[PDB]
Amino acid sequence: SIEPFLRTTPRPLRLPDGPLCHQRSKFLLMDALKLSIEDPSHEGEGIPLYDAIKCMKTFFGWKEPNIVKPHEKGINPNYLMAWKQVLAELQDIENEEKIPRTKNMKRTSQLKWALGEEPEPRSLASWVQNEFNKACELTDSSWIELMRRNYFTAEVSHCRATEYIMKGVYINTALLNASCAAMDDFQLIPMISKCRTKEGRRKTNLYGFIIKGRSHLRNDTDVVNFVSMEFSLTDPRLEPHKWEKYCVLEIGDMLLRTAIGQVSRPMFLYVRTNGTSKIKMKWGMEMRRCLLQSLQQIESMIEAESSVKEKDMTKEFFENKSETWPIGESPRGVEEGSIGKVCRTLLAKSVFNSLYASPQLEGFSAESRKLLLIVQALRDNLEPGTFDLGGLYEAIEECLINDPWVLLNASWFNSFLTHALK
């Protein structure tokens, strides 16, 4: 047992300095706005374009679009015209007798430009954590329909992370089917999800639209470009840094019954060019694994107090919300929460790893795990080998460049370290 002053105490990870990091998800998350219709009792999925037009008719404040925050590295008139083009093509759909299953758009110069026919460091913005927190919360809707599996499902079904799973399975499946069927065409794809309301009725939700570019996906790695056009009530001027990749239009005036009364708030459209791949789409389609996986994680945490007290305390832990796990960290103190919070926190982590999947995250995960093990052994006073901490910190920190989710994960590790080796 070597002398104290020789023992190595893992230092915090160094996060790069830079302009604040920017949104890089395939679709909006907390800033999303749904325009929704209540499905009939019989229900029966209608045609996406029909539903989309129906959903848009539930809003009554549409106005002439204008640019309120430009894409610095873009031709912003093309984004405005792209939106007007989408409305014109929806008008054309409306005028035909039958609604078609798919709509191929005119390949105008604005769409060809936008469909296209980063190693600079960034500092961690607070929006990333704020996102994670929103994913952890409960919505008033349930996004999943129907062991310890049942109690787990009660908790996550109304969870915002679960909305994101269903949103992402829908969009990626639409996008993939369009990619196979219409490789040359610029297809207009409604972004739709379905949920069940507190009252029990089924609801269809329009978040906006995606225009698919050319999609000759010979390989897994081959990329398809797309323009995303997404409603939101978020004013881009609150956090401009978040929206660096976007052109933002003002498209409408929305009425909200606020805490003072009826306010008019502007509705916006967040527009950007983005890309995806056969393999990335297929992974988006697999996002329901995120429920199986976080389920496995929770069942394993309930297989610790099941081989400690010689009797599974599932009905206990779930039925009694007096048992708590450490979940957050106010500088006030370590926030604790019911098994529900834990289920949702873990889901949100699994989901966010899917949504923000990247090479940086692959590196960070493989390396930070090994340091994590060392930190746990140090905390248990076990004297692990620290001889390779130099190589390990290097392997981790070369993954800390600009990816917002990796940066957040690094920042989380640093907090854990402080508390672990206090």
Partner: peptide, 10 residues
Amino acid sequence: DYNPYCLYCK
């Protein structure tokens, strides 16, 4: 501010 790592400190 939720941090999944605090679950390691049960």
